Amino acid sequence: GEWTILERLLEAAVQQHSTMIGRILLTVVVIFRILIVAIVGETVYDDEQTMFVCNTLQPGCNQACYDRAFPISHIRYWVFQIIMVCTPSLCFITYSVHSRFYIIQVVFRNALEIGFLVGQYFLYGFSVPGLYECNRYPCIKEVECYVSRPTEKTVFLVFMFAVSGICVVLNLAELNHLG
Amino acid sequence: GEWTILERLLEAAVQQHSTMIGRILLTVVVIFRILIVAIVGETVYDDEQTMFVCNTLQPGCNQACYDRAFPISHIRYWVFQIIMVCTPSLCFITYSVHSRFYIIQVVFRNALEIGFLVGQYFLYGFSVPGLYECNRYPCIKEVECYVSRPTEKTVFLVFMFAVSGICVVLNLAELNHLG
Amino acid sequence: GEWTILERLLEAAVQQHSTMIGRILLTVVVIFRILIVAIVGETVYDDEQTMFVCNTLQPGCNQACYDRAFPISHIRYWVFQIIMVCTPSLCFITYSVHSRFYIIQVVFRNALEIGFLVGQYFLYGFSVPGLYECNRYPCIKEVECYVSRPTEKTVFLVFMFAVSGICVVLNLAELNHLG
Amino acid sequence: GEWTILERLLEAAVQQHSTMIGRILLTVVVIFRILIVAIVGETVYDDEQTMFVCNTLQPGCNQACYDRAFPISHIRYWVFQIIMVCTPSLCFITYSVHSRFYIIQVVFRNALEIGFLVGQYFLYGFSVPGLYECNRYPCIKEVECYVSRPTEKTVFLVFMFAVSGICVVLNLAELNHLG
Amino acid sequence: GEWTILERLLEAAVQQHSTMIGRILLTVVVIFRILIVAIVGETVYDDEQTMFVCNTLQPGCNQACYDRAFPISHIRYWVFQIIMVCTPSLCFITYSVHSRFYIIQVVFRNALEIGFLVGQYFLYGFSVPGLYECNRYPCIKEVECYVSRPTEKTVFLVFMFAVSGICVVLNLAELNHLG
Amino acid sequence: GEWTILERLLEAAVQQHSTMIGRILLTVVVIFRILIVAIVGETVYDDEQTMFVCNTLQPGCNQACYDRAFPISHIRYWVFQIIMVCTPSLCFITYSVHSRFYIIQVVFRNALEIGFLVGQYFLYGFSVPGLYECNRYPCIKEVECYVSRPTEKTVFLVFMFAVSGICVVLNLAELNHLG
Amino acid sequence: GEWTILERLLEAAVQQHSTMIGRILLTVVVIFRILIVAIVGETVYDDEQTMFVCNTLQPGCNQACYDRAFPISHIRYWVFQIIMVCTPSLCFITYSVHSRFYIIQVVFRNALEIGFLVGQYFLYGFSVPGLYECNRYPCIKEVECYVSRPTEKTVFLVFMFAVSGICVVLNLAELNHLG
Amino acid sequence: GEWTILERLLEAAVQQHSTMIGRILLTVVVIFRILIVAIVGETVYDDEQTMFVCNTLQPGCNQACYDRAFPISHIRYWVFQIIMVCTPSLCFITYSVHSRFYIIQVVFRNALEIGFLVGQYFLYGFSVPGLYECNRYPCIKEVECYVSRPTEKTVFLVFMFAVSGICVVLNLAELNHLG
Amino acid sequence: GEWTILERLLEAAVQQHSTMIGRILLTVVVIFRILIVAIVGETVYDDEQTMFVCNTLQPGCNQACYDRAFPISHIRYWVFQIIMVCTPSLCFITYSVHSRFYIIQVVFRNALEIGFLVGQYFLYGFSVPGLYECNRYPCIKEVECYVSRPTEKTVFLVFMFAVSGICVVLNLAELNHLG
Ligand SMILES: CC(C)CCC[C@@H](C)[C@H]1CC[C@H]2[C@@H]3CC=C4C[C@@H](OC(=O)CCC(=O)O)CC[C@]4(C)[C@H]3CC[C@]12C
Ligand SMILES: CC(C)CCC[C@@H](C)[C@H]1CC[C@H]2[C@@H]3CC=C4C[C@@H](OC(=O)CCC(=O)O)CC[C@]4(C)[C@H]3CC[C@]12C
Ligand SMILES: CC(C)CCC[C@@H](C)[C@H]1CC[C@H]2[C@@H]3CC=C4C[C@@H](OC(=O)CCC(=O)O)CC[C@]4(C)[C@H]3CC[C@]12C
Ligand SMILES: CC(C)CCC[C@@H](C)[C@H]1CC[C@H]2[C@@H]3CC=C4C[C@@H](OC(=O)CCC(=O)O)CC[C@]4(C)[C@H]3CC[C@]12C
Ligand SMILES: CC(C)CCC[C@@H](C)[C@H]1CC[C@H]2[C@@H]3CC=C4C[C@@H](OC(=O)CCC(=O)O)CC[C@]4(C)[C@H]3CC[C@]12C
Ligand SMILES: CC(C)CCC[C@@H](C)[C@H]1CC[C@H]2[C@@H]3CC=C4C[C@@H](OC(=O)CCC(=O)O)CC[C@]4(C)[C@H]3CC[C@]12C
Ligand SMILES: CC(C)CCC[C@@H](C)[C@H]1CC[C@H]2[C@@H]3CC=C4C[C@@H](OC(=O)CCC(=O)O)CC[C@]4(C)[C@H]3CC[C@]12C
Ligand SMILES: CC(C)CCC[C@@H](C)[C@H]1CC[C@H]2[C@@H]3CC=C4C[C@@H](OC(=O)CCC(=O)O)CC[C@]4(C)[C@H]3CC[C@]12C
Ligand SMILES: CC(C)CCC[C@@H](C)[C@H]1CC[C@H]2[C@@H]3CC=C4C[C@@H](OC(=O)CCC(=O)O)CC[C@]4(C)[C@H]3CC[C@]12C
């Protein structure tokens, strides 16, 4: 992934006036989200489908049950969330050199943070179990499948949920501050 | 992929005078297309032929049915589209330092955007199913094949179609603005 | 891993006034931790699950016993520790350009160093043996499993424990210096 | 490996006053060690365990005999040696901007060079044979194993020993020069 | 099978006085039962467990589901029935050379014929299907298994049931004849 | 197969008065049917299911398509026909020692010969092809299967049909002779 | 097995004077033991070691656990018992043509019948389970193994125990008769 | 094969008056044909299709090329020839107990011997080579196949041709003797 | 094995005058040797080389170590011994119909019995262990191999040694009787 283009864009997008809460929120976003996703998370989800196995002899059942158990990977959801959260801060380049803008940005950023947090709760939950039960064609009746590295993905889920809750609390604090 | 050469060329190609609609179009192109293709999309289509399987014993039938089901990969079509869309904006370097030019650029950019959107509709459609039916030599009669990660590629297709429709609407808005 | 973003952040975060002990601690952190993790350690833990084998015919027992023997990889724990240790020094950017701060930073850095050292002692220990005994479902009764590169991971464990003990001694020396 | 961080640190660490012998030693270190390890040596030791085979049917005997024959890889020992040798020259950044220092640096650098040369002689020797005899559990009695690319690793061993002997001779020449 | 010992015993056991119905019953028994079992039936049930397959990867599930689907083979039940039916006629050798005996023999032969016919109805039924559903340990949940030569074993079942019904009708005819 | 019991029964069953046509029919039956089935035919149909293959990866499709292509083996049909044809001649033992009988025997033997000849025509035909097309569950759509020793089974079919036609012509000749 | 030599020897050994109980015992021995072992039992124990499987990857563990679970096959024990029981009746040929002898024969036959019945109880028991637990070298710790055709061997065990108990009761009846 | 039925039939068929040449012909037939086919030849052609291999990956090509190279096995042709040659001598049982007959028998026996000798020359030839070239569907273009035990089948072919030529010479000698 | 030819020869060879000890010896030979070898022993040694395995990857090492561990099978040694022991009793047919002969026969029979008993002690011993150690070419150094059915072959060895010792004691008793 070409993270240096996003780095240079975020360097040119952090020149806008911000409050204390906004700078604490940017510090949490830079440290607890970007460096961890861009350094640690890529290799964890590397052998997700290679080391996914099911107890059957039916061709094509592994693909069906893997696609049914993990519709979207965690890492790609987090990368999309990171890109979308910083979008309101990237519209400053277009709107500047070319206080209502600040309020609109804050409102949109709060709505995005809450939407992504709720979507993360509904998509995944709080844990990744080590077994899965599958009843999708072409598999015959119900079969059982086994997952790769479930403990380290439960740890990743819990850590990301905690960081997103912190950023949501700071967003609501600043929203109350504006009034 | 060497995306930093395109970055430096687009940095030297965005010095041309543009309208408000043109800057909104460039912002949508930079955010919703380049960062997602250059960060997220490369790894999704990595095991497309390795995890493609068919129910047969005939040598060479997997290659024939994979080539018949996916004549061109989605990711390479999107990269070519990204390069071609920014071509009219890259001819400014040749035509400058060396308002009719602006109008010609707008006309060509609208024609390219509509051509690629229609070609994307005719090549792929709106969904990627999880099964395929193949009747190509050397396969005997019709055989059935199974696809890798179909839900996340339906999600990618829908997202790209929405972004291309937004950029087409802005292109027609600016075309009407010029008159 | 994108270590150059952390490099540029640590270049912009080392402009704070520091004592002699703090500069010796930063030199030990830069040399004995970052260059070794960022150059040497990545390739050692590359085939940890591919070259992990157990003596059984049960599908899914390799995944269960590998997840039970190594809940979190050493390399990811060390990367997270490196990021967290430098966090108090990365809050200077937010708190500066925007002596109590120095004392609070020292207290938090000492607490983090001791917490990570104790957690490393409780998670892993001092050696990595070459055999493992597993009694987790779906494995039948107890089975025996064999580990990849155990001597070079015992060497890595001992080296990291020695460096962390040195940095803890310097942190307590500076804490006594402040009084 | 992130060799550009070490490059930038060595660029900022070569601003210290040095003698003629010290500059010849730095030239030999830069050319005959860093460029060869950082360009040529990484790919040679890539399939060391994949292309290591033994004549047996016992599960887990390949891991035991590979770990017994190569406790530490040559390439990682050389990288650690390169980092440690340049450490005395990297303490100048801390000790400068913040002739006894020069003498202490020379003494420590000579001790490190001799220690690593003797350790390299005792760990490996002068050649890498193409056969190995193993009598480690779980292997039954003694078994025979075959090695990958032994001639090119004997060539690498001899070349590195010659370069280290040259740098040791220059270190003792400068030590005599100081008196 | 040593059928010639039974042949010589039945040659020495058919010297007893019998009625017309008893000789018709012996003719049906000799032709429609002994020659067909002793010539045709042995090879049909030769690959019953070798060509029995189930859709699973679990060791030991084939043995469990084959033992659950066919507790006793058809051919061995028929051989035991043939031996037991001729037992009352083989007690004449002991009771002769050494009309109440004739009546007791007829009563016992009728009871045996009806018992075996009812047991054959309850054990097997009228058809052998080509699929089986198994939920026995160590198989996980329910699995599906496929049978070898089901049409020719349905034909064998129907033929044997018809012959046994004919012999039962003749036994009841003679029982009524005695009064 | 225990053919010597049938031999001894046919030796004790050929003591009945017969015409010239009946003795020619018995000679054709003894030579062209019993010796060939009892010597030559057993080994030809030994590997019928072992050397039967289909082009698929579906478990259980070989059993389904083999059972659909050969509901009853040729050799077992011929053995049953041989036993049934000689049945009217085996009722002489019961009816003798214990000319209307001769006429009834001739009528029943002609009816059996014609019934078996017509059934052989409808079951099999005149040739055994080397390919088969199968569309039975669990096979997906239509698959193609290959047969073992088809030329030698076409030769066997033609030879048996010719011999049965000769015996039918002699049976009708004797039936006309009686009037 | 050459059962016709034993047949001819038992034909020449049954010319001795015997009582009513002795003839009933010989009838039970001839029918319920010899014909069933010589016709039915040989094929049941044909694939005992081929269809015996264990859940392991260790070479040589199948042989060790099969030899530990079935030290002597049931069928060979029954054949030896049949030969030994008829031995006292086969010494009449030597002692005749060449009432104390009759009494000695009865005493020895009763002792043999009781010894074999008790040995059968202690060797096997009353049932054959479908699972076995093995802890014999070279198997690692305890492993689990699966048995072939356990229900039909429990049926065989029960039938043989019932017949042996009947023959023991008749032997003790005749022993009391002699006084 | 049940050769004892043919033995007993040939014992009852050699009671006809014969000349010296006819008895020499019967001696050659009994010794050089029946004992060798009935003792030696059965096991040679046992693994003809199991040990027949071709250099391809196409399913079903082995069956096609084996059926094309050996339309009828040598051993079955020889058994049929043996049965047919003795047929004229087996019609004596029907024609006797029930010199023109002798002449008709001699004429038919000579015609059969010459027909079978010429058919053996045209079907097979004089040698069995060790390679075969096959261009039959489903094989792609021409493929090469390898034969099992070719030298011992060339020896068998030559021996049988010599014996058949001797019997043909004796048949023509006796035909000339009759005139 | 054609044991009925030996049966008929031993029936025609037991017409010679013999003493009481000679008839007891013939009874022990007929019962405890011929019926057990001809009924029980053939199937025990059926899978001796198929179920013999060694822990290696070297082609041809199984054949070498099996031939080194079992130079001659037990069953073939016992069959040869049975044939040779009865040879002196088979020379009576030649020497009769065509008391010094009796003495010479007794002397030769005693010498043969003692020679075979001593040879059996030196060839095999008293037990068959379950492991074997092999150091024969092409095996590399020493390897370990595992044996099939060792307990039932130790039982067979002990039983045969006991019977041979009984027959040797009776032979020496009769030798002393002659004087
Ligand atoms: C996360 C995905 C699924 C939807 C992403 C939608 C974005 C494309 C949204 C989120 C932030 C939104 C922007 C937030 C702020 C505004 C400012 C608004 O203009 C101003 O505040 C300045 C001019 C004025 O004062 O009216 C125009 C719309 C815009 C750009 C919004 C348009 C819709 C945006 C770009
Ligand atoms: C997407 C693929 C399949 C075709 C790509 C074709 C391009 C090579 C096209 C699209 C944009 C086009 C250019 C758009 C604008 C013009 C300007 C035109 O010149 C001017 O407007 C300036 C001089 C003048 O005023 O006449 C000369 C042709 C050119 C470069 C066009 C030539 C053909 C181009 C390069
Ligand atoms: C390692 C993981 C599991 C927890 C990481 C928690 C961090 C997010 C902690 C460790 C360092 C802490 C900071 C260390 C120093 C302080 C300074 C404190 O403010 C000051 O010293 C300046 C203003 C003043 O003088 O009060 C406010 C809290 C803060 C940022 C702390 C908040 C909590 C932080 C960021
Ligand atoms: C290779 C591994 C196994 C051990 C690496 C140990 C290093 C951490 C050693 C080697 C070089 C040593 C340094 C070489 C020079 C000196 C200078 C000495 O101070 C001075 O010369 C300046 C002040 C003065 O003049 O006293 C303080 C110790 C120090 C940093 C040494 C401390 C121990 C160091 C850092
Ligand atoms: C099929 C299996 C499960 C049970 C087999 C039981 C047999 C052992 C049965 C069936 C036939 C029975 C026999 C049928 C006839 C009689 C005759 C009866 O004696 C007489 O009729 C003659 C003396 C008299 O007139 O009393 C003594 C019992 C006996 C042998 C019966 C005893 C029990 C037998 C042998
Ligand atoms: C081939 C299969 C499917 C059916 C086999 C049916 C047989 C059991 C048939 C064919 C020959 C038939 C027999 C042919 C001749 C007669 C003679 C008939 O009696 C007599 O001719 C003698 C007494 C008299 O003169 O009436 C009684 C029926 C019976 C035995 C027939 C009964 C039915 C039989 C046995
Ligand atoms: C089942 C296995 C383990 C041991 C088999 C031992 C046999 C060899 C036993 C069982 C029956 C026994 C025989 C039973 C009867 C007698 C009769 C006895 O002589 C007589 O009764 C007749 C002369 C006399 O009246 O003394 C001599 C011993 C002998 C043959 C016994 C010797 C030992 C025998 C042969
Ligand atoms: C080898 C296969 C392909 C054909 C086998 C045909 C047989 C069935 C042939 C060969 C010998 C032939 C027989 C040879 C001798 C004669 C004698 C002939 O009658 C006599 O010689 C006696 C009465 C008389 O003198 O006319 C009637 C035909 C018959 C049986 C022939 C009929 C046709 C037979 C049986
Ligand atoms: C077991 C194998 C390895 C050697 C087998 C050798 C046999 C072929 C031996 C054992 C018994 C021997 C026979 C035992 C008895 C004698 C009798 C002897 O003649 C007589 O006693 C009758 C005439 C006379 O009184 O001299 C001639 C040799 C011969 C047949 C012996 C010749 C050698 C024989 C056949």
Q: State how far the Cα of F34 lies from the Cα of H83, in Å rounded to an integer.
A: 12
How far apart, in Å, are the Cα atoms of A158 and each of A126, A163, D174?
7, 9, 58
Under 8 Å between Cβ of A5 and B38: yes
* Tokens found for residue B12: 């030297």
Chain A interface, best mutation among F58, F139, F141, by max A CB count within 10 A? F58
How far apart, in Å, are the Cα atoms of D85 and each of D3, D13, D106, D166, D172?
15, 13, 11, 14, 15
Cα-flanking dihedrals φ and ψ of residue F57, to 5°? -115, 10
Q: State how far the Cα of D37 lies from the Cα of G153, in Å rounded to an integer.
A: 69
Region at A165 (left for phi over 0; alpha for psi -120 to 50; beta for the rest) = alpha
Ligand 1 centroid–CA A33 distance in Å is: 23
Name the residue of chain C whose CA is nearest to E57's CA: C59
- Alpha carbon G11 to chain centroid, angstroms: 21
Q: What is the dihedral of CA G39, G40, G46, G49, to 10 degrees?
A: -140
Chain B interface, best mutation among F56, F61, F134, F142, by max B CB count within 10 A? F56
Residues of B in Cβ contact (< 8 Å) with A79:
39-40
Which residue type, as a one-letter code, is found at position H25? L
Ligand 2 centroid–CA B8 distance in Å is: 22
> B150-178 and B74-85 helices cross at what angle (nearest 10)?
20
Residue G80 beta carbon below 6 angstroms from any ligand 7 atom: no
Helix/strand number for chain A, H first, E second: 10, 3
Residue G88 beta carbon below 6 angstroms from any ligand 7 atom: yes
Q: State how far the Cα of D81 lies from the Cα of D97, in Å rounded to an integer.
A: 27
Under 8 Å between Cβ of I112 and I85: yes
SS (H, E, C) B131-164: EEEECCCCCCCCEEEECCCHHHHHHHHHHHHHHH
Under 8 Å between Cβ of I72 and I141: no
Which residue type, as a one-letter code, is found at position F169? V
Residues contacting ligand 3 via CB (< 6 Å): C 84, 87-88, 91, 100-101, 104-105, 108, 112
Nearest-atom index, ligand 1, CA of A91:
30
Ligand 1 centroid–CA A167 distance in Å is: 20
Give A85-120 as a DSSP string: HTHHHHSHHHHTT--HHHHHHHHHHHHHHHHHHHHH
Residue C156, min C-alpha distance to chain A (Å): 19
Beta carbons of A90 and B27 less than 8 Å apart: yes
Nearest-atom index, ligand 4, CA of D109:
11
The radius of gyration computed from the CA coordinates of chain F, to the nearest angstrom, equals 20
Under 8 Å between Cβ of A120 and A78: no
Experimental method: cryo-EM
Q: State how far the Cα of D104 lies from the Cα of D116, in Å rounded to an integer.
A: 18
Bridge partners, residue A131, by sequence? A146
Ligand 8 centroid–CA H88 distance in Å is: 7
Chain D interface, best mutation among G55, G56, G57, by max D CB count within 10 A? G57
Q: State how far the Cα of H130 lies from the Cα of H151, in Å rounded to an integer.
A: 8
Residue A100 beta carbon below 6 angstroms from any ligand 1 atom: yes
> Which of the other chains make 3 or more beta carbon contacts under 8 angstroms with chain A?
B, C, E, F
| Residue of B57, B142, B144 with shortest CB distance to F55 | B57
A121: Cα within 13 Å, side-chain hemisphere: 8
Contacts of I156-159 spanning 24+ positions with Cβ under 8 A: I156/I41, I156/I44, I156/I74, I157/I74, I157/I124, I157/I125, I157/I126, I157/I127, I157/I128, I158/I126
Classify residue D28 by its DSSP letter: H
Residues of E in Cβ contact (< 8 Å) with F49:
47, 51, 148
Q: State how far the Cα of D156 lies from the Cα of I21, in Å rounded to an integer.
A: 86
Measured by CA distance, the residue closest to atom 16 of ligand 5 is E104
Ligand 6 centroid–CA F105 distance in Å is: 7
* Tokens found for residue A101: 């803008």
Beta carbons of E59 and G51 less than 8 Å apart: no
3-state secondary structure of F120: helix
* Tokens found for residue A134: 């599958």
3-state secondary structure of A173: helix
Residue D108 beta carbon below 6 angstroms from any ligand 4 atom: yes
* Tokens found for residue I164: 């041979």
Biggest alpha carbon distance in chain E? 64
> D100-123 and D74-85 helices cross at what angle (nearest 10)?
170
Q: State how far the Cα of H64 lies from the Cα of C29, in Å rounded to an integer.
A: 73
Ligand nearest to the CA of C115: 3
3-state secondary structure of I133: strand
Residues of G in Cβ contact (< 8 Å) with I151:
67, 71-72
The radius of gyration computed from the CA coordinates of chain E, to the nearest angstrom, equals 20
* Tokens found for residue C56: 């059984």
Q: State how far the Cα of A72 lies from the Cα of B153, in Å rounded to an integer.
A: 10
3-state secondary structure of D40: coil
Residues of E in Cβ contact (< 8 Å) with F56:
none
Under 8 Å between Cβ of F108 and F88: yes
Under 8 Å between Cβ of C146 and D137: no
Q: State how far the Cα of E126 lies from the Cα of E161, in Å rounded to an integer.
A: 8
Ligand nearest to the CA of I163: 7
* Tokens found for residue I70: 């079992």
Measured by CA distance, the residue closest to atom 28 of ligand 1 is A104
Q: State how far the Cα of D103 lies from the Cα of D107, in Å rounded to an integer.
A: 6
Q: Where are the beta strands (DSSP E) in chain B?
A: 53-54, 131-134, 143-146
Contact of chains F and B by CB distance (3 or more pairs under 8 angstroms): yes
G164: Cα within 13 Å, side-chain hemisphere: 22
Pocket test for ligand 3, best of C87, C92, C99 (most atoms within 8 A of CB): C87
Q: State how far the Cα of C103 lies from the Cα of C178, in Å rounded to an integer.
A: 8
Chain G interface, best mutation among C55, C134, C139, by max G CB count within 10 A? C55
SS (H, E, C) H19-35: CHHHHHHHHHHHHHHHH
3-state secondary structure of F135: coil
Give chain H as a DSSP string: --HHHHHHHHHHHS-S---HHHHHHHHHHIIIIIIHHHHTHHHHTSSTTTT-EES---TTHHHHHHHHH-SS-HHHHHHHHHHHHTHHHHHHHHHTT--HHHHHHHHHHHHHHHHHHHHHHHHT-S---SEEEE--TTS-S-EEEE-SSHHHHHHHHHHHHHHHHHHHHHHHHHHHHH-
Residue E114 beta carbon below 6 angstroms from any ligand 5 atom: no
Q: State how far the Cα of I140 lies from the Cα of D132, in Å rounded to an integer.
A: 13
Residues contacting ligand 6 via CB (< 6 Å): F 84, 87-88, 91, 100-101, 104-105, 108, 112
Residue of F29, F72, F18, F19 lying closest to F168 (CA atoms): F29
User: Going by C-beta distance under 8 Å and a sequence separation of 6 or more, which residues neighbour residue I75?
Assistant: I37, I41, I42, I44, I45
Cα-flanking dihedrals φ and ψ of residue E144, to 5°? -120, 135
Under 8 Å between Cβ of H131 and H146: yes
Q: Count CB-CB contacts under 10 A for residue G32.
A: 20
Helical residues (DSSP H) of chain D, grouped into ranges: 3-13, 20-29, 36-39, 41-44, 61-69, 74-85, 87-95, 100-123, 150-178
Ligand 3 centroid–CA A26 distance in Å is: 15
Residue of B77, A11, B47 lying closest to A3 (CA atoms): A11
Residue H112 beta carbon below 6 angstroms from any ligand 8 atom: yes
Q: Where are the beta strands (DSSP E) in chain G?
A: 53-54, 131-134, 143-146
Residue B111 beta carbon below 6 angstroms from any ligand 2 atom: no
| Residue of I55, I140, I144 with shortest CB distance to D144 | I140
The angle at the Cα of A104, spanning A103 to A106, to the nearest 5 degrees, equals 65
Q: State how far the Cα of H36 lies from the Cα of H33, in Å rounded to an integer.
A: 6
Residue H61, min C-alpha distance to chain B (Å): 12
* Tokens found for residue I43: 């199937």
Under 8 Å between Cβ of G143 and G64: no
Cis before F71 (ω within 30): no
With tokens 């990811």, the residue in question is C76
Q: State how far the Cα of A76 lies from the Cα of B36, in Å rounded to an integer.
A: 10
> Which of the other chains make 3 or more beta carbon contacts under 8 angstroms with chain C?
A, D, E, G
Give G132-152 as a DSSP string: EEE--TTS-S-EEEE-SSHHH
Bridge partners, residue G17, by sequence? none
Residue E108 beta carbon below 6 angstroms from any ligand 5 atom: yes
Q: State how far the Cα of I41 lies from the Cα of H8, in Å rounded to an integer.
A: 33
Residue of A73, A79, A80 lying closest to A49 (CA atoms): A73
Residues of D in Cβ contact (< 8 Å) with I140:
55, 143-144
Residue of C83, C90, C103, C105 lying closest to C15 (CA atoms): C90
Name the residue of chain E whose CA is nearest to A55's CA: E57
Beta carbons of E144 and A142 less than 8 Å apart: no
Overall residue count recorded for chain F in this entry: 179
Helix (H), strand (E) at residue D145: strand D143-146
Ligand nearest to the CA of D80: 4
Under 8 Å between Cβ of E17 and E102: yes
Beta carbons of D49 and C47 less than 8 Å apart: yes
Helical residues (DSSP H) of E52-149, grouped into ranges: 61-69, 74-85, 87-95, 100-123
